[PDB]
Every structure is written in C-alpha cells, then in structure tokens.
Coordinates of N, CA and C in Angstrom, one line a residue:
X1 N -8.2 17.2 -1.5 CA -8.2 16.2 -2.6 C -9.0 15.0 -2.4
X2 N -9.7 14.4 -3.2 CA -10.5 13.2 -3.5 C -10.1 11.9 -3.7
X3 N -9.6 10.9 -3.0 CA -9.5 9.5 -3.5 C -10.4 8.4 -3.3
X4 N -10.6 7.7 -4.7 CA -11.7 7.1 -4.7 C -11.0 5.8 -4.7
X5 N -11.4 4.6 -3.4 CA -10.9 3.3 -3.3 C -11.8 2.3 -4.1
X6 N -11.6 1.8 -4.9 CA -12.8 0.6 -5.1 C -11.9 -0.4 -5.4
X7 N -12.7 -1.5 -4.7 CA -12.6 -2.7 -4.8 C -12.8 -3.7 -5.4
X8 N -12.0 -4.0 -6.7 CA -12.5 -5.0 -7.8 C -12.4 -6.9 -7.9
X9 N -11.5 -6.9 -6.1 CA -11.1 -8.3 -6.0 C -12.6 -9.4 -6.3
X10 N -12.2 -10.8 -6.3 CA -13.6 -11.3 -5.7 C -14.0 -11.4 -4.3
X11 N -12.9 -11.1 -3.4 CA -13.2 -11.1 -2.3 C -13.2 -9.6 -1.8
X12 N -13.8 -9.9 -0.5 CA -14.0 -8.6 0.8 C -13.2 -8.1 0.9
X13 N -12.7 -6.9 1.1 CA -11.4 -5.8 1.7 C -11.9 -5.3 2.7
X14 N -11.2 -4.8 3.5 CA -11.4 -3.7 4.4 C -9.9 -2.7 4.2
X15 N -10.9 -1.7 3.7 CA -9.6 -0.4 3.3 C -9.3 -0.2 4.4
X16 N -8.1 0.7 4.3 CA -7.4 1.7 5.5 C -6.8 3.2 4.6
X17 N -6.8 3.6 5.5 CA -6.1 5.3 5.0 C -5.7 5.6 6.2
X18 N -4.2 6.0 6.1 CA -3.3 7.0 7.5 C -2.1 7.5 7.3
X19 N -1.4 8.3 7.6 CA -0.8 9.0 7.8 C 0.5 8.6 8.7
X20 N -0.1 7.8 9.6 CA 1.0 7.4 10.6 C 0.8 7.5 12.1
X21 N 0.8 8.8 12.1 CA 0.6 9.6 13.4 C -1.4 9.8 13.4
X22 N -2.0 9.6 12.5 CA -3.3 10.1 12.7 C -4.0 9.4 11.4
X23 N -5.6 9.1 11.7 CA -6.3 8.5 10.3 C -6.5 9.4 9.1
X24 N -6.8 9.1 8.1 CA -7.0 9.9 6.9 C -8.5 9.7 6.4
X25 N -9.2 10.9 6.7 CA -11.0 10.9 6.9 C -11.2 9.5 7.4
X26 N -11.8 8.7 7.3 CA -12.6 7.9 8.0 C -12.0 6.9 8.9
X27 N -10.3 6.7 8.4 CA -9.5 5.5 8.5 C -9.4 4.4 7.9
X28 N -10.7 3.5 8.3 CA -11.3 2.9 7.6 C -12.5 2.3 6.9
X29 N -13.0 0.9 6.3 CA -13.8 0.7 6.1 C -14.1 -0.5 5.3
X30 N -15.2 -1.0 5.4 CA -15.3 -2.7 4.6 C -15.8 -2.8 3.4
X31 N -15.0 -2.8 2.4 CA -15.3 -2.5 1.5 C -16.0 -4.3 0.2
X32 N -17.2 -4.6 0.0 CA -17.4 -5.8 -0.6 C -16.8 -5.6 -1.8
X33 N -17.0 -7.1 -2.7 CA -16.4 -7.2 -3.6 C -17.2 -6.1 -4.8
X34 N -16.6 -4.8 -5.6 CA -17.3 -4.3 -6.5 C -17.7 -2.5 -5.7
X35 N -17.3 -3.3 -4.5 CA -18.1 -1.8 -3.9 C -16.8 -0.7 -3.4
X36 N -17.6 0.6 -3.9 CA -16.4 1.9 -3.9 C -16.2 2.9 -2.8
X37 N -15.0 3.7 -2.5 CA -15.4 4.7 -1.1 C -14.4 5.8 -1.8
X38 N -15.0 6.9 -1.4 CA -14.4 8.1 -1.9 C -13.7 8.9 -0.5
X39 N -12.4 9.2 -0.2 CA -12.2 9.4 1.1 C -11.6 11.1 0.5
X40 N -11.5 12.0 1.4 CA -11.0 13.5 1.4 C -10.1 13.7 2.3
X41 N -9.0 14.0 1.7 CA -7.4 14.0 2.1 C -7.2 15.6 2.1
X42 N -7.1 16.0 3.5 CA -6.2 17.2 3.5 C -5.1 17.9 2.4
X43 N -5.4 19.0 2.2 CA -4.3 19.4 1.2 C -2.9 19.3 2.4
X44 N -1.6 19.0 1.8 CA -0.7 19.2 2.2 C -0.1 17.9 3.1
X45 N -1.1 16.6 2.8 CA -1.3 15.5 3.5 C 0.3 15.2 3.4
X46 N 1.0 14.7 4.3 CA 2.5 14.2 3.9 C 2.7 12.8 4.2
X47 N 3.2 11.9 3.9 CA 3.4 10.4 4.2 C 2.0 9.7 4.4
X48 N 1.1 10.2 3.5 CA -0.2 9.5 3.3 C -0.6 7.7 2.7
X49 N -1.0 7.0 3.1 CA -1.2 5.5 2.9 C -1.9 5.3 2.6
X50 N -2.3 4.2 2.0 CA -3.7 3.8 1.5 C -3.1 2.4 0.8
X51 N -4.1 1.2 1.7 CA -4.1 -0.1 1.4 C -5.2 -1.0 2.2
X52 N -4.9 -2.0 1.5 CA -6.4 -3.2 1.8 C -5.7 -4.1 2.7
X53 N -6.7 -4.8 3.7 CA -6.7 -5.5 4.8 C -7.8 -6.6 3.9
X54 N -6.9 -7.7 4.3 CA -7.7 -9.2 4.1 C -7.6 -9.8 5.5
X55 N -9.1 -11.2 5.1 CA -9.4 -12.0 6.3 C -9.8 -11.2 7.4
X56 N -10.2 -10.1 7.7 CA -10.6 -9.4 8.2 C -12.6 -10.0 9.8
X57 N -12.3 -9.8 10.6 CA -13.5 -9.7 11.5 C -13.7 -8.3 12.7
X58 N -14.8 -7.6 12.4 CA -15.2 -6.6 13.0 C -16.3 -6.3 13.9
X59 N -16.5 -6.5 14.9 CA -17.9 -6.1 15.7 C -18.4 -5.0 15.4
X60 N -19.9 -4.4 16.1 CA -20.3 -3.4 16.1 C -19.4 -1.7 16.9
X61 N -18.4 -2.8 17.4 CA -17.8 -1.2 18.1 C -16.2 -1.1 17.4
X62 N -16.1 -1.7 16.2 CA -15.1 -1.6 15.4 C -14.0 -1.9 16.0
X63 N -14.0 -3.1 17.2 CA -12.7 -3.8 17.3 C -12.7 -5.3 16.0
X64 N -11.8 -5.5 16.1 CA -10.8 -6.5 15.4 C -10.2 -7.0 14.8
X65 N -9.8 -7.8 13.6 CA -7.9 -8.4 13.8 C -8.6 -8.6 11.9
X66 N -7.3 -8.5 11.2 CA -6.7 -8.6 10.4 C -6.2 -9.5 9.9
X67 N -6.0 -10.3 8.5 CA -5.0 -11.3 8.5 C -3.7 -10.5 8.0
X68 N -4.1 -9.7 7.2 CA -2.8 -8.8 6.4 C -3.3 -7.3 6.9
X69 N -2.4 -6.6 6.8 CA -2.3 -4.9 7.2 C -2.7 -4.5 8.4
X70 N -3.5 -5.3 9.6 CA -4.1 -5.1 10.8 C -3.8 -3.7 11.3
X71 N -3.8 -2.8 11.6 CA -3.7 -1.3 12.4 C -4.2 -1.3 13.4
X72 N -3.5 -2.2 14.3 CA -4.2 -1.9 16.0 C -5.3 -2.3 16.3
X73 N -5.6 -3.5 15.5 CA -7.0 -4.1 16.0 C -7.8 -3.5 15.8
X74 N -8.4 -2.3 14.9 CA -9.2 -0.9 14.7 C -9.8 -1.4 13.5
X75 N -11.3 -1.1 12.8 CA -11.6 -0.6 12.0 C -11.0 0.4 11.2
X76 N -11.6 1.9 11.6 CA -10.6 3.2 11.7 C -9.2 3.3 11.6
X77 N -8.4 2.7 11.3 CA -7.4 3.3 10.8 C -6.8 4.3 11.5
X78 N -5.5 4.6 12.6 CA -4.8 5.8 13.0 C -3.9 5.7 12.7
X79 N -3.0 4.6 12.7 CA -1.8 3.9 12.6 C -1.4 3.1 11.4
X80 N -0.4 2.7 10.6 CA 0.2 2.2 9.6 C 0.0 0.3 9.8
X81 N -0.5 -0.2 8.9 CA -1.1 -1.7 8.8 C 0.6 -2.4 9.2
X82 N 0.3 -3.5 9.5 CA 1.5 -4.5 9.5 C 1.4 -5.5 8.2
X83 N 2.9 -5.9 7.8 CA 3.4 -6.2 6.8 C 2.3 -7.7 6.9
X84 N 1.8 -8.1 5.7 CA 2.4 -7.6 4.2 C 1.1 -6.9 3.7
X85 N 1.6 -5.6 3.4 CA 1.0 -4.7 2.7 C 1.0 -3.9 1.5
X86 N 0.3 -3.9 0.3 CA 0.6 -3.5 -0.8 C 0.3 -2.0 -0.7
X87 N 0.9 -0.9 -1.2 CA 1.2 0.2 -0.2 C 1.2 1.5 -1.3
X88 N -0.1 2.0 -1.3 CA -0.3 3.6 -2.5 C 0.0 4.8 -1.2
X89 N 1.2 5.7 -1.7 CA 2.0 6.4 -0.8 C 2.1 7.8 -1.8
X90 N 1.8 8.7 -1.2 CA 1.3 10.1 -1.0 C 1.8 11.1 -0.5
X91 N 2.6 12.5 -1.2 CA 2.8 13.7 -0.1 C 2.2 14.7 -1.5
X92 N 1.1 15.3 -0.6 CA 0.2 16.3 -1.8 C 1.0 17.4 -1.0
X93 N 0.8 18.9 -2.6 CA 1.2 20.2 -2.5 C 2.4 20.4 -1.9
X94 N 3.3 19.6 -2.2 CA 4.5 19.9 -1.9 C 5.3 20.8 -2.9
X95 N 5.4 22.0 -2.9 CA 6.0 23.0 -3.7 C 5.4 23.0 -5.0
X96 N 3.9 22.9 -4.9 CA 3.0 23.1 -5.6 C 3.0 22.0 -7.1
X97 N 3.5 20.3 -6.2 CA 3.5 19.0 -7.0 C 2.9 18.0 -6.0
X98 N 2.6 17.4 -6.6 CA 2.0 16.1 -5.7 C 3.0 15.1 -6.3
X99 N 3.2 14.2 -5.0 CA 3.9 12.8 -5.2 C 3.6 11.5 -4.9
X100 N 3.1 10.4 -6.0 CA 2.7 9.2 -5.4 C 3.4 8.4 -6.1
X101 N 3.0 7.2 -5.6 CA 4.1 6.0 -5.5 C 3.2 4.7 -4.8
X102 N 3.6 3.2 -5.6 CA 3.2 1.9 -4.8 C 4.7 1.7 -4.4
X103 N 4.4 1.2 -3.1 CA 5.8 0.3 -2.2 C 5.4 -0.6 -1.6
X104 N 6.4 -1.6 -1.8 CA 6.5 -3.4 -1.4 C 7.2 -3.5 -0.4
X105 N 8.0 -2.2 0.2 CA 8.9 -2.0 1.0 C 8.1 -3.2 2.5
X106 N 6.9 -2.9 2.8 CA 6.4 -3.5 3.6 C 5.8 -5.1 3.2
X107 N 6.1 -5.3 1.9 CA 5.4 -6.7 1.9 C 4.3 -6.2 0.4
X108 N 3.6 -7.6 0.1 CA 2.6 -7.4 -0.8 C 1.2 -8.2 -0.6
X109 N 0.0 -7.6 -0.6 CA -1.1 -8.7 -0.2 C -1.9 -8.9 -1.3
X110 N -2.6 -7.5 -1.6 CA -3.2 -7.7 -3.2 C -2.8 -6.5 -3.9
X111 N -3.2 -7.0 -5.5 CA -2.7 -6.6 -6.4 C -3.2 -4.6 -6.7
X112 N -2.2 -3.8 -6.7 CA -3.1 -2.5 -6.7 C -2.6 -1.5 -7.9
X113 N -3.5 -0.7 -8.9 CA -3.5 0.4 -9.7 C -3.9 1.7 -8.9
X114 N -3.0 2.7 -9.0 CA -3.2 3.9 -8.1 C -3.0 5.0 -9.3
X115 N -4.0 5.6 -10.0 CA -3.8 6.4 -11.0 C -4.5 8.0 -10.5
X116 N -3.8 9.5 -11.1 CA -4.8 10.0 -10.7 C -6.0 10.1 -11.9
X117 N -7.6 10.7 -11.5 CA -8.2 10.9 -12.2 C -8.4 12.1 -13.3
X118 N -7.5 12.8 -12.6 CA -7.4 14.7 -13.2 C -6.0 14.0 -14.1
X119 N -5.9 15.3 -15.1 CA -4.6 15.7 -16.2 C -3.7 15.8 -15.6
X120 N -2.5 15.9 -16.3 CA -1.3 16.0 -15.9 C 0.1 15.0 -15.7
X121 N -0.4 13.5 -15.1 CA 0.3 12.6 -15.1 C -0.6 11.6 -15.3
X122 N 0.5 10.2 -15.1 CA -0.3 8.7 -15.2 C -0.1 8.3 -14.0
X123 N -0.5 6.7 -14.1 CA -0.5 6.1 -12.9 C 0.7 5.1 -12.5
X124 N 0.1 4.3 -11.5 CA 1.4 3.4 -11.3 C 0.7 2.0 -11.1
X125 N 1.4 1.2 -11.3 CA 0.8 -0.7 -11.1 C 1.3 -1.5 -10.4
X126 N 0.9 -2.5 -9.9 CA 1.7 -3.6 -9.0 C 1.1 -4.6 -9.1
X127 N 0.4 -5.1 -10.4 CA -0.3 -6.2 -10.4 C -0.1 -7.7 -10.6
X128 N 1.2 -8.1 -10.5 CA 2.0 -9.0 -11.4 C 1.6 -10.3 -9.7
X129 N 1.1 -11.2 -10.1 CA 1.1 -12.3 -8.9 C 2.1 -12.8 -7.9
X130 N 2.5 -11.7 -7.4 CA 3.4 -11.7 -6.2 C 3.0 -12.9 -5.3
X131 N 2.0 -12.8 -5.0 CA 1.8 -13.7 -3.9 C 2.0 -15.3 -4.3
X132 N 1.6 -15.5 -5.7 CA 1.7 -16.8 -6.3 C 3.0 -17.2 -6.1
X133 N 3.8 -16.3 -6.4 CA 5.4 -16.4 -7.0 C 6.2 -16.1 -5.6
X134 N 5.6 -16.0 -4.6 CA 6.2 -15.7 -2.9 C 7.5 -16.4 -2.8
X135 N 8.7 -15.7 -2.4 CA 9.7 -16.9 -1.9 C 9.2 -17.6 -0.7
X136 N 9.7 -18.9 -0.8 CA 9.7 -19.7 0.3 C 9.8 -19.1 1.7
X137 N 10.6 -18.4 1.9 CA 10.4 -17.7 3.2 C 9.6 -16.4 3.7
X138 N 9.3 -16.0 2.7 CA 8.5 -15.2 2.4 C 7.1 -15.0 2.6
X139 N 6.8 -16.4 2.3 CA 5.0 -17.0 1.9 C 4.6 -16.8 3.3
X140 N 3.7 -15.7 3.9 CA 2.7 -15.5 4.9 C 2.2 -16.5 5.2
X141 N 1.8 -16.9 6.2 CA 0.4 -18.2 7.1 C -0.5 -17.2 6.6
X142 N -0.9 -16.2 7.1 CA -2.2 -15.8 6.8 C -2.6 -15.0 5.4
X143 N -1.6 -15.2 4.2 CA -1.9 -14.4 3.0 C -1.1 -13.4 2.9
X144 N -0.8 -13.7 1.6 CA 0.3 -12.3 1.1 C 1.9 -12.6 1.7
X145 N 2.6 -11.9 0.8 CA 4.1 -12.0 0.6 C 4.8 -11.1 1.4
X146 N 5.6 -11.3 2.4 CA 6.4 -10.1 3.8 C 7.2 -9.8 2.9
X147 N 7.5 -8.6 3.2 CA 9.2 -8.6 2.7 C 9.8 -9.5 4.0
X148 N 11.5 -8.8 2.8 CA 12.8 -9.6 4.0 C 12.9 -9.0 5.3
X149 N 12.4 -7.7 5.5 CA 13.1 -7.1 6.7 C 12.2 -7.8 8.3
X150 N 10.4 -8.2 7.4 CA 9.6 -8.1 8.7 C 10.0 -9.7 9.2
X151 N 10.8 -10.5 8.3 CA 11.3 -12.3 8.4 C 12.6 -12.0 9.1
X152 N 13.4 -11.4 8.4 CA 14.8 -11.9 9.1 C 15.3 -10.8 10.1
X153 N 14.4 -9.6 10.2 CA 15.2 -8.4 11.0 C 16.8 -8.5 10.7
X154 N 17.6 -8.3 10.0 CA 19.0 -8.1 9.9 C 18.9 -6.5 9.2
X155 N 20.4 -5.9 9.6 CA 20.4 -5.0 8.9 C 20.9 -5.1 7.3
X156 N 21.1 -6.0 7.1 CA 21.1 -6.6 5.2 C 19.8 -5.9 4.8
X157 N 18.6 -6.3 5.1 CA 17.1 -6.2 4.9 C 16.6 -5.1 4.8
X158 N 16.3 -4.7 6.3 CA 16.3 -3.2 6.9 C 16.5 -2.3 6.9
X159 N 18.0 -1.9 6.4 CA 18.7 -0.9 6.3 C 18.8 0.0 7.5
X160 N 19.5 -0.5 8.6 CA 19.7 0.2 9.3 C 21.2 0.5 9.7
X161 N 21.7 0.1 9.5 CA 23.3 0.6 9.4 C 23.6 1.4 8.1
X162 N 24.9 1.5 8.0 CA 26.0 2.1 6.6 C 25.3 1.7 5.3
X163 N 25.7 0.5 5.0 CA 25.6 -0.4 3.4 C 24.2 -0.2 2.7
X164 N 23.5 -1.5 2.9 CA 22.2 -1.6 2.6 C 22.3 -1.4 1.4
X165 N 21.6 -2.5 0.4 CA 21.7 -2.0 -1.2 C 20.5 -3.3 -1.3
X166 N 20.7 -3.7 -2.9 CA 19.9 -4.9 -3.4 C 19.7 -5.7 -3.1
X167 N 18.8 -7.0 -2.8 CA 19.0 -8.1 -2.1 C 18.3 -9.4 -3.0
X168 N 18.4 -10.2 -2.8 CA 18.0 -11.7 -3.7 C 16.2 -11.3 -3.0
X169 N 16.0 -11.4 -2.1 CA 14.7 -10.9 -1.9 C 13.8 -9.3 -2.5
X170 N 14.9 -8.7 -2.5 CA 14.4 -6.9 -3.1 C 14.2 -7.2 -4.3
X171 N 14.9 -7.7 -4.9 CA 14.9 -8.0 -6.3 C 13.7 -9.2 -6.9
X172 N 13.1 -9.9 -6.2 CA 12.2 -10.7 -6.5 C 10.7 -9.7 -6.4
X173 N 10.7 -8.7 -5.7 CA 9.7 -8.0 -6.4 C 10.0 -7.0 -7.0
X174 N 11.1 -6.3 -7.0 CA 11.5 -5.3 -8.5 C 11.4 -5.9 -9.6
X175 N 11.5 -7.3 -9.7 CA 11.7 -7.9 -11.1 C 9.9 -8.0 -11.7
X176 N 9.4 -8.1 -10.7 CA 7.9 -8.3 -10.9 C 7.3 -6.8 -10.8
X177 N 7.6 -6.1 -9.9 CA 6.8 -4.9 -10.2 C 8.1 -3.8 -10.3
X178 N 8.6 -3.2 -11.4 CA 9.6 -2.6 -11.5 C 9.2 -1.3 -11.0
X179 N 8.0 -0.7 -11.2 CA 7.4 0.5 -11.2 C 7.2 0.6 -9.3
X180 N 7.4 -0.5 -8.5 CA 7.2 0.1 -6.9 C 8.8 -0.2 -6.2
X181 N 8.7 0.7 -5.2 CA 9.8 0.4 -4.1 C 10.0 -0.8 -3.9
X182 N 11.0 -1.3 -3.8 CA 11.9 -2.9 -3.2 C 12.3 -3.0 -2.2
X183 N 12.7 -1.8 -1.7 CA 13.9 -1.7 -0.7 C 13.9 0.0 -0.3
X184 N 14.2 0.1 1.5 CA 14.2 1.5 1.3 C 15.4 2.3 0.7
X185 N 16.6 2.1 0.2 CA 17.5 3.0 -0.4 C 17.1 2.6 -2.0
X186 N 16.1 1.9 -2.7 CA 15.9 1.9 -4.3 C 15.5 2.9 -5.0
X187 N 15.8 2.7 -6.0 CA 16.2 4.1 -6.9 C 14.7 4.6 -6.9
X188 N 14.6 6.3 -6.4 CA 12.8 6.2 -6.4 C 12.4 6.4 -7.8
X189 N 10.5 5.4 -7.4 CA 9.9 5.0 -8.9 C 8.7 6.2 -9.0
X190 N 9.0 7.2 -7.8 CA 7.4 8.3 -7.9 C 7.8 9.1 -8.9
X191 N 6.4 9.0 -8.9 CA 5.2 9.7 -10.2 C 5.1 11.2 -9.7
X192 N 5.7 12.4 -10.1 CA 4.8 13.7 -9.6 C 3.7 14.4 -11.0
X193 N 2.9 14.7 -9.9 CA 1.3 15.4 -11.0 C 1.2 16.6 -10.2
X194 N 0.5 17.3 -10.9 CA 0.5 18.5 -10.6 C -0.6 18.8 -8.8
X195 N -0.1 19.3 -8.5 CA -0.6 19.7 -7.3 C -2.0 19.7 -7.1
X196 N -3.0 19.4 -6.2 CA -3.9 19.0 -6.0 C -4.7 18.0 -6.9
X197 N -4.1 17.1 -7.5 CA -4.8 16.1 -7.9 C -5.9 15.6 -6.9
X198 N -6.4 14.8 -8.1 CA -7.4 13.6 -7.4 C -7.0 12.3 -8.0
X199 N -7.1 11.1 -7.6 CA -7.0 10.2 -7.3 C -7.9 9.0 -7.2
X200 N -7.1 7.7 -8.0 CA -8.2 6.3 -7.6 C -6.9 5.3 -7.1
X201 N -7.3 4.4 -6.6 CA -7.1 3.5 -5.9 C -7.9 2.0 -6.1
X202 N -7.0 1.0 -7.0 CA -8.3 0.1 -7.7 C -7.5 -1.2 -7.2
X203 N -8.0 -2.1 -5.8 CA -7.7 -3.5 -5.7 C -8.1 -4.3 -6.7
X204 N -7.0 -5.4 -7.4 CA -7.2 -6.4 -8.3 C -7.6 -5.4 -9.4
X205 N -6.8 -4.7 -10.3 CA -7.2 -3.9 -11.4 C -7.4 -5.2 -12.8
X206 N -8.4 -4.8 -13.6 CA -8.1 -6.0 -14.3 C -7.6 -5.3 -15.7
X207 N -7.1 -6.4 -16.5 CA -6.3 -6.1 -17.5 C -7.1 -5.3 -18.3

C-alpha cells in the first residue's frame, strides 16, 4: 500500500513512519513546507504510525534531536516518537479490512487529515487548535500539547491498573477532536476501508 505524506504547514517537518519494533520504508525524512513523500507500507503492516517531528536538527549522518516526536535521536525512524505526537495509526489486511485511526493518546503537535485516496471509506481529522487551547499543565517547553499520562504518570492517566475511564484532561481533547482517541480505554473512533487501501497523510489540512 501507498501513503502519501505532504506537508502543508508553514513550517518544516520531519516525517516519521514505524511500526514500533522496526521503520516503515524509509523511517524518515525532512519534509519543507509544501513538499510531499510517498512511502510503501507492507501489506499486513500492524500497529503502523505515521507523524511529524518539529524543531528538528540533522547532520549528514542522520543523527539528531527533536523538539516533538524525537525517535531516538534518528532521522530514520525504527522506534515510536515521544509525546506530544499527533498520531495516524494503521493495521492493513486484517481479515481482508484495513483500519485507521488519529490518536492524541500520546499528546498533539500539529494539526493532521489522514484520508484514504481509493473508494470505499472517508477520512479522519484532528485539526481543531489544540495547541492554542493546551491546558496549563499540559503546554510543552518545546511545542505541542502532552497528554496527562507523559505529565503526571499516575495510573488515573495511564491506565494501568483496574478503573481507568474519562478524565478532565481526556476530555479536553475529545471535545476538540471527537473523531481521535483521548484515552486508551475510549470508545474506538477507527475508520475501516476495504483492504489494501491507499492513503494520504496531510499536516495543517486547510479548510
């Protein structure tokens, strides 16, 4: 399958694509303001990612640091960005459907449209100014909105114990982006399209 990243912010990005355990074709890449990357995703790809990295600096041997989503100090991409990350999430040909989805679960940095390009389904949005609207504890030093879990570690946040449900913070981006994850036990908001889609990925979609 084919996903095409482009970048419509005024500023620079540097995409990422992973998996978790491994990069997704290239990993990554610097993407300027206006300029596009088409990346090829394994059929069968499961817990696939795809998001933008701001404030970003890179040498010629593709070390360096991140202000939002960083993956190990890498260019390339092998590993999952650090919060706050605005988050297009992916398990293709699963019983012959594809499933995508944006999640805030990790935080939000910029604004993203993840539609596919083929028939069958629509897309999904998260463009509402999270960042503007950041709670107070929330508001990043270096850009973009954390969730509660990567601020307060409790299991309220996290969900790591028994309970875990809604929270005055979960709810401050479900109210703004109702269409993405809040929290990991929220009611899921994925989209399924028919099996081997293709795919776009548009930072700062404009109206």
């Amino acid at each position: 399958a084919t996903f095409e990243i482009v970048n419509r912010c005024s500023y620079t990005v540097w995409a990422a694509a992973s998996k978790g355990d491994a990069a997704l074709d290239a990993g990554g890449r610097q993407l300027n303001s206006g300029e596009s990357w088409t990346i090829n995703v394994e059929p069968g790809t499961n817990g696939g990612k795809i998001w933008a990295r701001t404030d970003c600096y890179f040498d010629d041997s593709g070390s360096g640091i991140c202000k939002t989503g960083d993956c190990g100090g890498l260019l390339r991409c092998k590993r999952f960005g650090r919060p706050p990350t605005t988050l297009a999430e992916f398990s293709l040909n699963q019983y012959g459907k594809d499933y995508i989805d944006i999640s805030n679960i990790k935080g939000f940095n910029v604004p993203m449209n993840f539609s596919p390009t083929t028939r069958g389904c629509r897309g999904v949005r998260c463009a509402a100014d999270i960042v503007g609207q950041c709670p107070a504890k929330l508001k990043a030093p270096g850009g973009g909105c954390n969730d509660a879990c990567t601020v307060f570690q409790t299991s309220e946040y996290c969900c790591t114990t028994g309970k875990c449900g809604p929270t005055e913070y979960s709810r401050f981006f479900k109210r703004l982006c109702p269409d993405a994850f809040s929290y990991v036990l929220d009611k899921p908001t994925t989209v399924t399209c028919p099996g081997s889609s293709n795919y776009r990925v548009t930072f700062c979609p404009t109206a």
